[PDB]
Every structure is written in C-alpha cells, then in structure tokens.
C-alpha cells in the first residue's frame, strides 16, 4: 500500500507555549541546551533567550537543573518566564524544529537504557553528538582499520502547520585520516547500498525499538502538548 518512511501528524500542530530564560552568552547557551536535552528540557537559543518546553512537573527541580547547568558554563541568567512565548510552528519553523528534535533526543535517551540490555558492543545504540541532527548509531565495523557505523538519521519538517518526521538509514565514517583507498569504498558501497528490504526492515526495527508499534510515534514536548504522529500508508487516489 505504498508505505513510506514519513511519520506525519493528523491535525494542525496546536499552538505551542514555551518558557524563556534570559541568557547573556549564546555561545555557551548552545552547549547548555545540548546538555540539558537529556534531563527533559527541550530548548532553543534565540534572541538572547533560551525558549524551552519541559516534561518535569516540579518547578523547583527544573529551576535547580537549569541553574546548575548554566553555572557549569559560566553564564549570567535570570528567572523563568512561565509561558514567555506562544509559537505557531509554521510562523517559527526553527523554534518548533529544534524543540521537537530535543524532545526526540530525550525520548531516545530514555529508551536506550532498556533497548540495550541484550546487546553487544557492536550493536549498542548511541546518539552521535556531532555535526548533524539526531543520529542513532546501531552497527559498528572496523573495516581495514577504518571505523564505520550504520544508523538511522532523523529529520523534522513543518508543512501546512503539520509535523513530518523522516527516519532513514545512513552510514557514517569516523576516521580522522583520509580514505585514499578503493577497496574501502568498494566495501562501503557493498554495505551502504542495499535493496529496499534491508532498509525497510532497518527502519521498522529502529521505530519499533523506541515506540513499540511502528505504525505511530508519540513524542511528548510538554505535560499537555504531545505530537502523536502516524506513518502514512496511503493506498491510492
């Protein structure tokens, strides 16, 4: 039924509400958001303010976590604004995109603890904290002393005020030196170009291991704002 790899929302992304904090150093604020993405604070640094949503009902707990993380980076900050801003995803696509990706990172991090018990060191899921978005690395190889890894990359788009998450299978190379070899490229093509059945089953496994049934994915951005997205499975005209 022409099933795809895209998980789309069903209604228009309801009005988002985010709490802002005044930060005087954007550069370290980016590292701050990267770090706090693990504790349930999904935020983006814009206009000197960290705008974020959270899944923590304890205001004191959230305040303590943010304050500690900000002190660790030598940042002068202010108090939480408690619904500082209202964001329609369509008007501000990057705000929603970054908050959504941070929430997805948090969900994947939470699932990692329980989807890695029965695994080997060459099959343990991880999140690559490098120059990319969300990347779940789940297969490792040392081909000719060249370290490579197969994983699933996630991307988010907002179209017609609706969220669309694309998960696909990508291979990456973390070798500091240059390839300069043809056998390595031959092997990398051998294992990175596959029929659309290794790829489809790879995507299915990736989604199932983090959301149970893979017909849908639920990503919680706040105590009341949850993106419940479904795979298309469109039949025909």
């Amino acid at each position: 039924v022409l099933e795809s790899n895209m998980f789309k929302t069903e209604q228009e992304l309801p009005e988002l509400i985010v709490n802002c904090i005044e930060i005087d150093n954007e550069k370290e604020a980016h590292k701050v958001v990267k770090e706090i993405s693990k504790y349930g604070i999904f935020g983006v640094v814009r206009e000197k303010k960290i705008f974020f949503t959270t899944v923590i009902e304890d205001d004191d707990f959230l305040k303590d976590r943010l304050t500690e993380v900000l002190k660790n980076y030598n940042i002068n900050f202010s108090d939480i604004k408690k619904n500082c801003k209202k964001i329609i995803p369509e008007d501000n696509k990057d705000y929603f995109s970054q908050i959504f990706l941070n929430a997805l990172r948090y969900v994947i991090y939470q699932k990692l603890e329980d989807i890695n018990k029965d695994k080997k060191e060459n099959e343990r899921w991880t999140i690559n904290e490098s120059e990319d978005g969300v990347y779940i690395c789940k297969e490792r190889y040392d081909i000719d002393n060249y370290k490579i890894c197969v994983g699933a990359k996630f991307t988010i788009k907002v179209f017609d005020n609706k969220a669309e998450l694309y998960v696909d299978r990508k291979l990456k190379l973390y070798d500091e030196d240059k390839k300069l070899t043809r056998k390595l490229r031959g092997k990398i093509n051998k294992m990175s170009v596959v029929e659309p059945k290794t790829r489809y089953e790879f995507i299915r496994e990736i989604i199932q291991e983090i959301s149970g049934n893979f017909d849908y994915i639920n990503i919680k951005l706040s105590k009341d704002y949850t993106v419940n997205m479904t795979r298309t499975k469109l039949n025909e005209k």
């Binding site: 039924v1 022409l2 179209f159 017609d160 659309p196 298309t232 469109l234 025909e236 005209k237």
Partner: protein, 444 residues
C-alpha cells in the same frame, strides 16, 4: 484533498518522433526515426595515444556507423547498418581524415584542436583523449566554440576500450549516435505537450519553462544560468544562456524574467500565457519580490523548487519485496495557500523517477535498479489552483527530453542540468556579445 498518491502510467508522457509518432520509449528513435535531422560531417580528432586507440576509433566511427556490411544490432529494430540506414540521416565519414594531434606542453591542446578544426567541411568535431586531458580541457573547448558552428563531442580512451566487452558495444554506440544527430542540428525527439493540459485545463498545450541552476566552482565563486524551454508539438526553441549564495538577486532576477519574456516573444510574441520556473533551490525573498514585480497578476506562474537531496523514501506492496514503481506521485495540498496575501506555496509533490519499469521485451520485461529510489520533492508555488498531477506529469516529461540519456532510468530535470552546465562553462567566456542567445546543443 489532503495527502493522497497514485502511480502515473508510463504511456502518458510520450515523446514525438518523425511523422508525429508518439511513444514513451526514447530508444524507439531506432524505429520511428528522429523527429528532425541534419547531415553529419564528422571530424574525428585524436590526441596522442597508441595504435589500439586509433583502431578502436576506426571500429566505432566507421565500421558501426558507416559500413552497412557490419550488421549492428541497433535494438528495437531488425534493420542493420549505419546511421544512414537505421535513423535516416546523411551520415558522412571516411577513415582517412582522422587527425593525429599531439601535445607536449600546457595550452597546446586548445590551439592544436582549433588549427585542426574545420568549419565548411564539418559541423561535428569528435575529440578523443585520455581523461587527464579531457577533464581539464573540455569546459575550455566548449566555451571557446560557444556560438560557433563547431560542436565538439568528446570521448575518452576508457569509453573506446569499453567497446571490446561486446556488452558495452551493444549499449554505448546508440546513446552516442543520438548525441551526434543532435549536435549536427537535428532534434532526436520532442516532448508531447498535451500533458500540459492536465496542469490547469484552462490553457493550451503551449507555455514557457525556465530553470535557474548554480555552478559552484568559478574559482571559488557561485554563478548560475537560466535555460529556456517551449513546446507547441512543432517548435522546441531550447535556448540556454546567461551572487553570494544559491539565489538570484532582485535586479538579476527581474532582468532574467524580462529576458525570458522577450525571448518567448521573439519566438511567437503571444505574451506567454503561463510561466513555469524550475529551480534547484528554495524561492529566495529577492526572487519572490522579482516575480511579484514583473509577473504580478498579468501572467499565471508556477515556481517549482526541485529538491533532490530529500529524506523521503517510498516502499510498499509488501509482496514484490518492497520495491516501488517508477512513476509514483505523493501529493499533499496546502490549505494555507495564498489568500491573495503573498503566501504562494501551493502543494508538495514527491515523485519517484527511478524504480521498477517495464521496457519493451525487444522480442515487456520488468526491470529494477540497484539500491533504493531517491525521489525528488517538488515544492510548488503558484498564483492559481494548479493541478499537482499535471505538475508531476510535466516534470516527468521534462526529465525525458534529454538527448544524452535515451532511456527512462534518470531523474534529473534536463533544463536544470543544462543550466548548471552552462553556468560551469561561463567561466571561460570573455565576450558577452552573442552569448545572450545560444543553443543547448553547444553545451549538450
């Protein structure tokens, strides 16, 4: 309504051959003859090589294309012989005019080829050289002969040596031959424009096309070209010629739109009823303002951003493994579209161009590619309620013109490809006098 999808039957994007023959397989040029033709006068210029190379050039350009005794396969047709027998063109070449060009210093190649190049006797000048020389002199030669009547057709030593496999000997000749009968002035085929009706059904099959593409290099500097296209079932007029980013400044975009309008007007002067503008990057604000300023409400327009690098993948049917038919279209309309305000994004159409296809059995056999299809995303902006199915069909037929890939195995938009090539070539042109209007055949 909402997000839906379908599969476009392959026999709906047909192309026209001689005697107005409609068929969806460009290789049927071997059965329906080229839509247009011109006598070919080859000048096979060879660069320093070895005896085997010259023997291979003789084998390719004489035994296959001239000698009727050599019964070459020429698929889809039982006819055997040279081009003059299979296609219906005045192919001319003798294995004694091949020139033994040699070089020993930088810049000798271009000068030697210019001296050995002849105008009155020859209109196609094949060039044969090793990759080391072609890779670094091809763009310069193309720029040097731009506008002139000497259209070159390069060939590498590896391609000639491939002719000994007997598998490549049955697939390399024909695609090259079409190029020949396109670089002598011929038109291997054109694209049936009736599909344009499915676009809107409120305008004839005619129209206008324009694809802005960017060439990066220019000695570490972004550049671009424009490209033009038009069809009426009898005319083609494919002319293609012309920045701190992958966008057209407002001034340049206004000038480009006006120049395209004037070009179409010089063609027939009917004030183009429709302006389709392909682009390989998102509609910048400058381009949006330029489109509003020049087109406004006078002309109906459709700005199609063709995103190749996309994350969307399409499988399905769970029975033929998970392979997807070639012509699959996923349409998503956008309700939040243009309340006469300035929000022009109309819909999004994801089309697969490479997948399962049924080409004729030559004696239909299902065929597939290696890997997984990479569909294209058609981010459509429009000032009217355009039909996404018509846009998808138009884009498919646009992929098919391409007198360099006679097949249904490609996905790139031809207008954008040749615009990018023209942008790369612009590097080495120092005279913008006759440049304003040159043919695609120069940079084919």
């Amino acid at each position: 309504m909402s997000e839906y999808a379908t599969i476009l039957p392959e026999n709906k994007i047909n192309v026209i051959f001689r005697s107005n023959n409609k068929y969806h397989v460009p290789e049927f040029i071997t059965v329906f003859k080229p839509y247009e033709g011109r006598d070919i006068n080859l000048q096979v210029l060879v660069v320093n090589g070895d005896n085997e190379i010259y023997d291979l050039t003789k084998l390719l350009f004489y035994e296959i294309y001239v000698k009727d005794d050599t019964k070459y396969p020429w698929p889809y047709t039982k006819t055997r012989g040279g081009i003059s027998r299979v296609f219906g063109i005045r192919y001319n070449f003798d294995p004694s005019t091949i020139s033994r060009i040699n070089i020993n210093s930088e810049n000798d190649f271009i000068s030697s080829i210019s001296n050995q190049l002849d105008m009155n006797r020859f209109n196609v000048a094949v060039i044969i050289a090793n990759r080391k020389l072609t890779k670094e002199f091809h763009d310069k030669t193309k720029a040097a002969l731009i506008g002139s009547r000497i259209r070159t057709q390069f060939v590498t030593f590896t391609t000639l040596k491939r002719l000994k496999n007997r598998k490549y000997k049955a697939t390399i000749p024909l695609p090259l031959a079409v190029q020949l009968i396109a670089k002598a002035g011929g038109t291997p085929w054109i694209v049936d424009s009736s599909i344009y009706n499915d676009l809107s059904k409120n305008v004839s099959s005619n129209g206008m096309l324009m694809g802005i593409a960017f060439a990066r290099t220019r000695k570490d500097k972004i550049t671009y070209s424009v490209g033009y296209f038009t069809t009426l079932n009898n005319y083609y007029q494919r002319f293609d010629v012309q920045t701190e980013g992958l966008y057209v400044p407002k001034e340049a975009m206004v000038k480009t739109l006006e120049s395209g309008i004037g070009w179409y007007k010089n063609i027939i002067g009917i004030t183009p009823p429709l302006l389709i503008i392909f682009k390989t990057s998102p509609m910048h604000k400058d381009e949006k303002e330029a489109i509003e300023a020049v087109l406004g409400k006078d002309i109906k327009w459709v700005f199609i951003h063709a995103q190749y690098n996309t994350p969307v993948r399409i499988f399905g049917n769970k029975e033929d493994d998970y392979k997807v038919n070639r012509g699959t279209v996923i349409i998503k309309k956008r309700k939040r579209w243009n309340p006469n305000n300035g929000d022009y994004l109309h819909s999004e159409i994801v089309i697969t161009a490479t997948g399962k296809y049924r080409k004729p059995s030559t004696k239909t056999e299902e065929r597939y590619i290696s890997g997984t299809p990479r569909p294209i995303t058609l981010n459509v902006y429009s000032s009217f309620d355009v039909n996404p199915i018509g846009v998808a069909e138009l884009t498919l037929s646009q992929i098919k013109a391409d007198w360099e890939h006679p097949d249904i195995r490609k996905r790139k938009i031809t207008v954008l490809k040749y615009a990018n090539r023209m942008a790369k070539i612009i590097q080495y042109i120092n005279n913008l006098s006759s440049v304003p209007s040159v043919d695609v055949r120069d940079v084919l």
